[PDB]
């Protein structure tokens, strides 16, 4: 199962990990990606998580998106996992660099709770423009189910774990 994870709260887990590394070695039911409404995976998590499947998440995407159109920003759709975990939820968060209202960011961290248990990273942080302060926030106050965050850089995992209320 999940390991050396710092407890947040009753629910919410926080490790500094590469969350393909995470992913690889837990093999857990869900993993989060952090999509966009085209799911075109090219850069960020989204980037690094499709690099892992050779590809055939982006292969997967295409078709889905050719049938069913974009999703919202806010939305998800679960797709598979391919190599990393058994189900890939990609989810939307509002990218605050493509102007994106930050509001949306509690209903991309509802999808969640569609989950018993989940490896994700902060929705809307890093290339997505948003502070992954707020966005921790907004996971500890919006997802119930179990959640283990993997945060990538170091440096910020500790200003996150240090500023945590």
């Known amino acids: 199962s999940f390991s050396g994870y710092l407890k947040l709260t009753d629910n919410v887990y926080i490790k500094n990990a590469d969350i393909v590394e995470e992913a690889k070695k837990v093999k857990p039911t869900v993993v989060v990606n952090a999509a966009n409404v085209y799911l075109k995976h090219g850069g960020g ?41 058994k189900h890939c939820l990609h989810v939307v968060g509002p990218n605050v660099n493509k102007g994106e209202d930050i509001q949306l960011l509690k209903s991309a961290y509802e999808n969640f709770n569609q989950h018993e248990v989940l490896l ?40 996150l774990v240090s500023s945590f209320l």
């Open 45 to 85: 998590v989204a980037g690094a998580l499709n690099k892992a499947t050779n590809n055939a998440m982006q292969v997967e995407s295409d078709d889905y998106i050719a049938t069913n159109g974009p999703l919202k920003v806010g939305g998800s759709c679960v797709l598979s996992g391919h190599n990393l975990a």
């Open 120 to 159: 994700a990273p902060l929705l809307s942080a890093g290339i997505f423009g948003a502070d992954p302060i707020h966005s921790l926030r907004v996971c500890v106050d919006t997802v119930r189910t179990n959640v283990y965050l993997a945060v990538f850089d170091k440096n910020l995992y500790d200003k």
